[PDB]
Design a protein around this ligand. Structure first.
Ligand SMILES: Cc1cc2nc3c(=O)[nH]c(=O)nc-3n(C[C@H](O)[C@H](O)[C@H](O)COP(=O)(O)OP(=O)(O)OC[C@H]3O[C@@H](n4cnc5c(N)ncnc54)[C@H](O)[C@@H]3O)c2cc1C
Ligand SMILES: Cc1cc2nc3c(=O)[nH]c(=O)nc-3n(C[C@H](O)[C@H](O)[C@H](O)COP(=O)(O)OP(=O)(O)OC[C@H]3O[C@@H](n4cnc5c(N)ncnc54)[C@H](O)[C@@H]3O)c2cc1C
Ligand SMILES: N[C@@H](Cc1ccccc1)C(=O)O
Ligand SMILES: N[C@@H](Cc1ccccc1)C(=O)O
Lengths: 509, 509
């Protein structure tokens, strides 16, 4: 018979909720848990904003789209477990505009943006129209290895993890046998492939992001109709022990002189909470670094990983319009997205309101990295009516006009704007401190192993999307939580329940 | 006589104020200007926060310290010209603690922080105690060349500008004849030299920053007694045409189908302001990228520079204490700064209140890059009292207690805290979008020439610290503003006043 044990789950995001769901499912005798959530809200970076309760009057501030690829199977099993209403998401739509250097894209014209050297720009002629082909040549070997077996593909990719994307492109790979590209060719590839400056981060991350967004299997994509927050509601409902919101952990400790299993504690608001056999920290690493972790005696390089593993910013801006003018007036009837070098960078047409004829939401700006930091600096809490008086609104409307200048005027977009919008910059969220992990050069191969290293005698686990090989996806959160529960059961020699974990949760539900 | 001409200065920071002061000094007949400032406040990144009107009850949110090195002569000339009350600033002080891996620094001790391989860390034994010496070996050649002639030293430095600092350290320089360092040695060097992740930006910037802070001439440092904003006040008082605050330029344009000199215009809140013969934009580049610049027909790589040139974040947190416990209880009597791997990173002891025995300000946290983004996520406008409930206040007090554990307790520091503090995160300022330019690899040698390329027939100038080789210093702003005025006078062949510019303003005041 198992002695009474209590574990602590720090953070009620999808990873912390997944840990509780797994523990609830295994039904281990005399085992309990507490879930402390710093925010008054539960879900973390699963966060649907509802403008009203109307059916499609929302947008997802955090996670929103899911590729049906084999490496994401655990995410889709969680969708099945909780009965999520999945519908098709259109990564690529029809008639979506692309606007660079104030020129619209056109198929089969050489250098439509007028950025090539032959047209007075600095992009080499043989690169300007061949970005996808040359990034495929740079990423494609590793992408196919990842498609056969993600873990073994990752281990081979780690042999070049010391390089940034720019570095790999500049030197022609690790030994100069790949093509070498000058600064402006690499710069154009970054402009056409990702957010500003992100090619100065890890090459391995550019490969994995390309694996996820441009997967060799050419997958179907999905969204959750009604918002991703429906997943949080369903996970919360099943909890045996409910989330305790407004409980921000500021310190974590283990008492190595105590003989007991439950010799760990966390401090919340100056008060001590002890008796825990294991602590799962599921917060973003910036939040973990603010805690007093001295009582845990972390390996010095593990502490370095908490502080230094790189995070990228992301900002989203969603506007409500009286009718879907992008559908009706521009023929953008199947989702997709418009991309531009204008400040909004990416305008995402929702896949969930394509049949609606009245009020409709447009995810008017979705940015990463410096683009998101620049948009996020306009994201305040008490903006002013009218639109022109709000700098962010006016910027978005002007960028939308230029981006859709083939069919709309600024005047008619402005008149369709209801005056209702919402924006969010994840780096300004004190409960995250960033959007998601996006490691720099050498971090996966050098710092990440020490982040995942056993701490406090195998009783402390750093959990979350950053503690995964799938950054910035729900799947990384779920894998990290599953792995941590494995280690917990292994640590306490609960062989019956570890075997049950592998039987029920390795491939599924 | 000269025909009447009008120029427009976008931005009332030190760049735009310097332009107006130069034009005021040259007294060019029938030449006028308008200065438009987006903010209700004038000064930009010269920004003193005054807790009260008491003599020393302030801290500088932006610029605060100035090294008396030859490359900084134009800044001190500006100080001299405006009668600034300069006092000595102590970059290094007495008894300043250094805290890494929860260990304090101790001279003459091997690996006092317990981070080397010999003590269970990952920092190479030959690196852990030699960061200053190995970085000097990596930067010193170029630092000495910059000391002889900054411009010629910069041009030689550009021959390795394709490399990041980490890349230069990893590969042993451009051809592998310098020492090669593994990831953890480079990581420790970054931890001990700059802010988190900044070794993943340009090697040239790490060299220039080392040249500024650790100059071979080993210079005296100075600050402005009463706050740097006294410089803004003095420059404002001299202006012939006063700053127009709350005037945010959203578009800049030139009418090439108009024969007049004054064929340029700017839009402010929908209304046009035309008749300008030249426009000086002095704003940060993120601010410029949000403007509609189509009417200027910028070179596409110049527009890329505006979007992509990298900015670093920075955040400051200052706390008021009933008495300077760092002076009286810790022997920290001569300014300096305490450095740590804790969230606050750097605690600066002011040099302007060393004789005070009552209320004193402490610049408790001064951070850059990801450190500043994480601290800045706690910077809100209406936080709660008491300190325990403001997460930022509590974090700072806790970090301060650990940093000064050799002489203070958390309880004594907390009781000395008045409850009055201020914080500021420059990336959250919509009038800047960042702290200052910190270019990535290859950006100085590739993007920066196009940023500085003549535009709109020589009538548009991108001015400011980012538009110089001295990023994040007043000197960069002054040099850029001086160079733009030169090119304006050259463009209109005002040879008499160009000669007067060189006579009075080249090494002038
Ligand atoms: C803009 C954006 C878009 C995304 N889009 C997608 C997408 O399309 N598809 C996809 O699969 N993934 C997407 N993701 C990724 C996905 O949202 C995340 O990977 C995942 O939700 C993170 O889960 P987590 O539990 O690991 O972290 P979190 O969600 O951050 O959970 C951690 C929790 O801990 C709490 N916490 C923090 N500090 C403390 C403390 N001191 N004490 C207690 N609790 C604390 C936080 O409030 C939070 O609730 C996106 C992420 C972002 C930022
Ligand atoms: C945290 C920090 C510390 C620093 N410390 C030092 C130091 O110790 N020593 C030193 O020498 N330097 C220091 N600097 C650097 C120095 O402060 C700057 O280099 C300099 O002040 C910038 O001057 P600027 O005029 O080029 O830019 P800014 O100061 O940014 O001036 C631009 C102005 O334009 C305005 N503007 C923006 N958008 C618009 C628009 N659309 N229309 C009109 N106006 C607009 C802005 O509000 C601003 O007032 C520091 C900088 C920072 C961020
Ligand atoms: N998965 C998220 C976040 C992400 C950003 C960039 C690269 C990879 C993932 C998205 O679909 O946008
Ligand atoms: N001038 C700023 C930032 C800076 C750091 C390093 C080099 C250049 C500028 C400071 O005093 O810290």
């Amino acid at each position: 018979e198992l002695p009474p044990r209590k574990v602590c789950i720090v953070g009620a995001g999808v990873s912390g909720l997944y840990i509780a769901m797994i523990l609830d499912d295994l039904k281990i005798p005399n085992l309990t848990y507490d879930i402390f959530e710093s925010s008054s809200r539960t879900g973390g970076r699963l966060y649907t904003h509802h403008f009203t309760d109307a059916k499609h009057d929302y947008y997802d501030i955090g996670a929103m789209r899911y590729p049906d690829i084999p490496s994401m199977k655990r995410t889709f099993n969680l969708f099945k477990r909780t009965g999520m209403p999945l519908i098709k998401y259109y990564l690529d739509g029809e008639n979506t505009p692309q606007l660079y250097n104030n020129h619209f894209f056109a198929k089969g014209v050489v250098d439509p943006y007028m950025v090539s050297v032959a047209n007075g720009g600095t992009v080499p002629d043989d690169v300007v129209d061949s970005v996808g082909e040359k990034l495929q040549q740079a990423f494609g070997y590793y992408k196919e290895k990842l498609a056969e077996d993600f873990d073994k593909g990752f281990d081979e990719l780690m042999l070049v993890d010391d390089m940034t994307t720019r570095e790999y492109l500049k030197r022609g790979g690790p030994k100069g046998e790949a093509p070498k590209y000058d600064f402006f060719a690499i710069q154009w590839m970054e402009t056409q492939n990702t957010g500003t400056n992100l090619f100065d981060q890890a090459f391995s991350e550019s490969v994995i992001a390309s694996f996820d967004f441009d997967n060799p299997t050419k997958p179907e994509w999905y969204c959750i109709e009604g918002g991703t927050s429906l997943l949080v509601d369903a996970m919360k409902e099943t909890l045996v022990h409910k989330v305790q919101n407004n409980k921000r952990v500021e310190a974590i400790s283990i008492d190595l002189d105590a003989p007991d299993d439950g010799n760990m504690s966390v401090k919340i608001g100056g008060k001590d909470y002890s008796g825990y056999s294991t602590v799962f920290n599921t917060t973003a690493l910036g939040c973990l670094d603010r805690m007093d972790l001295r009582g845990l005696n972390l390996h010095p390089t593990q502490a370095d990983a908490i502080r230094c593993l790189h995070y990228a910013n992301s900002t989203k801006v969603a506007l409500k319009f009286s009718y879907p003018w992008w559908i009706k007036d521009c023929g953008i009837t199947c989702g997709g997205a418009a991309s531009t070098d204008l400040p909004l960078r990416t305008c995402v047409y929702p896949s969930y309101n394509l049949g609606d004829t009245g009020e409709a939401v447009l995810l008017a700006s979705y940015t990463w990295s410096q683009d998101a930091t620049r948009i996020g600096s306009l994201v305040k809490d008490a903006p002013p009516q009218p639109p022109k008086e709000d700098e962010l609104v006016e910027l978005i409307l002007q960028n939308l006009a230029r981006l859709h200048a083939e069919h709309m005027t600024y005047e008619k977009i402005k008149e369709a704007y209801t005056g209702v919008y919402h924006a969010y910059c994840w780096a300004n969220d004190p409960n995250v401190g960033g959007a998601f992990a996006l490691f720099g050069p050498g971090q996966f191969s050098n710092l990440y192993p020490y982040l995942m290293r056993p701490a406090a005698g195998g009783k402390f686990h750093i959990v979350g999307e950053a503690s995964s090989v799938h950054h910035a996806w729900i799947i990384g959160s779920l894998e990290s939580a599953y792995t941590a529960v494995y280690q917990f059961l292994y640590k306490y020699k609960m062989w019956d329940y570890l075997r049950l974990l592998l039987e029920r949760w390795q491939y599924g539900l």
